[PDB]
């Protein structure tokens, strides 16, 4: 007689690079995803034949991200044909929903170990895909369904009263925290270096040290309002992967357990303010875990925009000093499919490193959704 | 103390031929929405009670793009409070949508889900608009991109399924579909769809009086034993299930079709992807503590007569217990929607026939299988 325990027992990712001008422009997303899958199981010294399934998050699963990129990446990584592979699109939250899927399968007794990963080459598959075909009836009846992400960011800045200067202070803090993490070697363990035509890429490319209020105040508005390129996550290339498995499996294979998955959630919201997704998703995981915000040691909230990240943190009553401890997406980047796996893996790794008890990973999703994962330390 | 996960609803569009059938004018997001709306109207269920819509789709791009789960959900008039996520495991996408939903019920992450799928093989072509095979795998491992027809021939050769044996399954599949359709036994699962041309309420792919003599006169499709007629057709269609806790079904006075007792995925060699159901079925049996002897009926997808027959023999199943109301040869195979149809139909048949246990299982492009084992609710 034993509690069902689902744990994160591995977290790896590529460095994240600016789309179009960064170090990963020449790497196919299927090849990049493969590199990280192979990197994770090599960091763990884990036989991939022990895995049930690879679940790969991807916002635009077409073109080089098509043909079930989970299964393509798995083949390309040299993993056995006995694994399953599936690709999951919940846009910005895809690879956090991959974690929820794998967690559900562990409870169903349908396998003991999974990779929950994500990928986005925002260089090689442009945000929106090819052949964008909006529903004509929804364009007329419900146009907010297809609202630009930047307009949702302005809507939140207005409706939740987040000034341009307040957004710019988050940008300064997110870069300063990433720089401090990188320079202390605190991003090294999670990174799988990637071979490219130009050479080995081993370090994050989106961090801009010395980001400061005076230089930010000179930038042009991006969406005819308060938001700028610097208070918006950049177009990013990258992949992240987690090992999601039973506590028993991790113990059996001598794996270090980063954290236990204690509760999960999805919540819909109004598309016009999609950035507020995290509020209902976080309230759900607290209600399901039997916890309050005062119980949470740290939070990874994705910085899709400063406007929505700040509006969420205020609405939940979170201390900004407990947010995005090693930097957030303004600095680190936001390759859509990969972010959920990254912020979940990172929250787990930070909970273990900081000696905390509980953490939450949460983000917003285009089309009006939020996802959250509540993590618990393992003794 | 287990939570019990049930199927408490099954709806689908009529399934029609790609390019020449009755659904060619319906965008797949619109077709999925019609089925979502039909399902909740059949159940008289308020969709505000639903946690999430999980939509299977083999090619989630263009008219199937932009997270078709969420688009279909909005188009059906469901509240913004629901989640929406699109899942691609090609042929098995919407069975993996059931598996996802069942795990979320167990996690206590919601009590009611729609697990659905859609494919308009008319309006999004197989391979998508920008097929880009991994250059390294084209060199190292070309079988990854093997055509489904070549895998069907591989299985016919290696598992010794003659062209006549394949044609005998084509005959029985169509005959079984005609018996069901003629007795009104397909009507309850169907949501009629409005089209520019008028209301479509009947399946289009059934070819009544399909027979050995006429099949034997057709030309091979893949330089072997397989023909157009022993291959599932290119199909347009959508299917949706209500996957929910037993407590939620009882509380809302919903008729339960079946309990989900076990689930599985299993990888296999892409070059014989059609044998996916063997390891997937053996997994759900082992997990359920059951033998093939225990199973009253099976829905095994008829992607190809060759792989369906080869799997049925490998598992030692009585053909009389397979695809009671017809199989994909006759009903159609709109990739993203098939897993939800065969799981849904297997649950509905388990209830209608008074059996204890059923299996829904299928093969998947890229070498995978999926299986769901269902139990009658006492």
Length of chain B: 378
| β pairing state of A84-89 and B83-88 | antiparallel
Half-sphere exposure in the Cβ direction for A131 (13 Å, CA) = 17
> Which domains are present in chain A?
6-127+234-376 (3.40.47.10)
Separation in Å, CA A313 to CA A306, A374, B81, B287: 10, 16, 20, 43
Write the CB contacts of B25 (distance below 8 Å, at least 6 apart in sequence): B195, B196, B197
Q: How far is CA B110 from the centre of its chain?
A: 24
What residues of chain A lie within 8 A of the CB of B52, using their CB?
266
**A169-203 b/e with 16+ CB inside 10 Å = b?**
bbbbbbbbbbbebbeeebbeebbbebeeeeeebee
Q: What is the resolution of this structure in A?
A: 1.8
Judged by a CB distance cut-off of 8 A, whether residue A15 touches chain B is no
> Catalytic annotation on A58?
no
Cα–Cα dist B14/B33, whole Å:
14
Q: Classify burial at B135, counting beta carbons within 10 Å of its beta carbon; exposed 0-12, middle 13-18, buried 19 or more.
A: exposed
Three-state DSSP at A121 gives strand
Among A131, A271, A367, beta carbon nearest to B129 = A131
Nearest Cα neighbor of A341 from A30, A40, A28 is A40
Q: Are B78 and B24 in contact (CB under 8 A)?
A: no
Which residue, A132, A127, A124, A62, is CA-closest to A92? A127
Classify residue A219 by burial, with Cβ atoms within 10 Å: 0-12, 13-18, 19+: middle
DSSP element (H, E) containing A9: strand A6-13
CA B367-B371-B375 angle, 5° bins? 175
In chain B, % helix, strand, coil (3-state, to 5) comes to 40, 20, 35
Which residues 127-186 on chain B approach chain A with CB closer than 8 angstroms?
Answer: 127-137, 141, 144-145
Hey, is the C-beta of A217 within 8 angstroms of any chain B C-beta? no
Q: Which of B303, B376, B375, B370 is nearest to B98 (CA)?
A: B370
**Do the chains contact at A64 and B132, CB–CB below 8 Å?**
yes
Which B residues, 340 through 369, put their C-beta within 8 Å of a C-beta on chain A? 365-368
In order, the DSSP letters of B109-152 are S-SEEEEEEEEETTTS-TT-SS----HHHHHH-GGGG--HHHHH
| CA–CA distance, B118 with B109 (Å, rounded to integer) | 25
SS3 A158: helix
Could you give the CA distance from residue B207 to residue B178 in angstroms, rounded to a whole number?
Answer: 8
Buried/exposed code over B256-279 (b: 16+ C-beta within 10 A; e: otherwise): bbbbbbbbbbbbbebbbbbbbbbb
Q: Which residues pair with A274 in a beta bridge?
A: none
Question: Residue B187, Cβ neighbours under 10 Å: how many?
Answer: 12
Whole-angstrom distance, CA of residue A152 vs CA of residue A272 = 5
Method for this entry: X-ray
Residues 6+ apart with CB under 8 A from B263: A105, A108, A110, B98, B99, B102, B284, B287, B370, B371, B372, B373
Q: H or E segment at B239? A: strand B235-245
Q: Which residues contact A248 (CB under 8 A, 6 or more apart)?
A: A2, A5, A112
- Given a contact cutoff of 8 angstroms between Cβ atoms, the answer to whether A118 and A89 are in contact is no
CA B233/CA A292 separation, integer angstroms: 54
Residues A312, A279: contact at Cβ < 8 Å? yes
Please tell me the distance from the alpha carbon of residue B216 to that of residue B209, in angstroms, as a whole number. 14
Nearest to A240 by CA among A120, A349, A91, A150: A120
- In this structure, the strands spanning B112-120 and B52-56 are parallel
Other CB atoms within a 10 A radius of the CB of residue B157 amount to: 13
C-alpha span between B11 and B285 (Å, rounded): 27
Q: How many of the other CB atoms lie within 10 Å of CB of B352?
A: 14
Burial of B361 (0-12, 13-18, 19+ CB in 10 A): buried
| Residue of A76, A105, A265 lying closest to B99 (CB–CB) | A105
Residue B81 C-alpha, separation from nearest chain A C-alpha, in angstroms? 4
Rounded to whole angstroms, the Cα distance separating B4 from B264 reads 17
Minimal C-alpha gap between B331 and chain A (Å): 25
SS3 assignment, position A32: helix
What is the sign, positive or negative, of the torsion defined by CA atoms of A222, A171, A344, A78? positive
Handedness of CA A31, A32, A38, A42 (dihedral sign): positive
Q: How far apart are CA B16 and CA B121, in angstroms?
A: 10
Cβ pairs A/B, distance under 8 A: 220
Two structure tokens written together for B168: 């005998």
Classify A92 in phi/psi space as left (phi over 0), alpha (psi -120 to 50) or beta: alpha
CA nearest neighbour of B56 among B279, B336, B363: B336
- Would the CB atoms of A87 and B89 count as touching at under 8 Å? yes
């Amino acid at each position: 007689m034993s509690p069902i325990s689902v744990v994160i027992a591995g977290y790896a990712r590529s460095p994240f690079h600016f789309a179009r001008k960064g170090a990963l422009v020449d790497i196919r997303p299927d090849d990049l995803a493969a590199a990280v899958l192979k990197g994770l199981v090599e960091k763990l010294d884990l036989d991939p034949a022990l895995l049930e399934d690879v679940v790969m998050g991807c916002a635009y699963p077409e073109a080089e991200q098509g043909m079930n990129i989970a299964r393509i990446a798995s083949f390309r990584a040299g993993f056995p044909q006995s694994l399953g592979g599936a690709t999951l699109n919940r846009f910005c939250g895809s690879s956090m929903s991959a974690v929820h899927y794998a967690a559900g399968q562990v409870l169903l007794g349908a396998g003991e170990a999974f990779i929950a990963a994500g990928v986005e080459s925002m260089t090689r598959v442009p945000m929106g895909g090819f052949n964008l075909s909006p529903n004509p009836a929804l364009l007329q009846d419900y146009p907010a369904v297809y609202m630009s992400m930047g307009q949702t960011a302005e809507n939140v800045a207005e409706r939740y009263a987040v000034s341009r200067v307040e957004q710019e202070e988050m940008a300064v803090r997110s870069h300063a925290k990433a720089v401090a993490a990188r320079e202390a070697g605190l991003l090294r363990e999670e990174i799988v270096a990637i071979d490219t035509p130009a050479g080995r890429v081993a370090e994050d490319g989106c961090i801009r040290p010395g980001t400061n209020l005076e230089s930010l105040a000179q930038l042009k508005p991006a969406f005819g309002g308060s938001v700028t390129a610097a208070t918006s996550s950049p177009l990013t290339d990258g992949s992240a992967a987690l090992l999601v498995c039973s506590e028993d499996f991790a113990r059996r294979h001598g794996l270090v357990i980063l954290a236990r998955i204690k509760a999960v959630a999805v919540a819909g919201c109004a598309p016009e303010i999609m950035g507020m997704g995290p509020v209902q998703a976080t309230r759900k995981v607290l209600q399901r875990a039997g916890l309050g915000i005062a119980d949470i040691d740290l939070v990874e909230i994705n910085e899709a925009f400063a406007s929505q990240s700040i509006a969420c943190i205020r609405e939940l009553g979170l201390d900004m000093d407990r947010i995005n401890l090693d930097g957030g997406a303004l600095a680190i980047g936001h390759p859509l499919g990969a972010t959920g796996a990254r912020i979940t893996g990172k929250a787990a790794a930070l909970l273990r490193r900081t000696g905390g008890r509980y953490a939450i990973a949460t983000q917003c999703i285009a089309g009006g959704q939020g996802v959250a994962t509540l993590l618990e330390a393992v003794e």
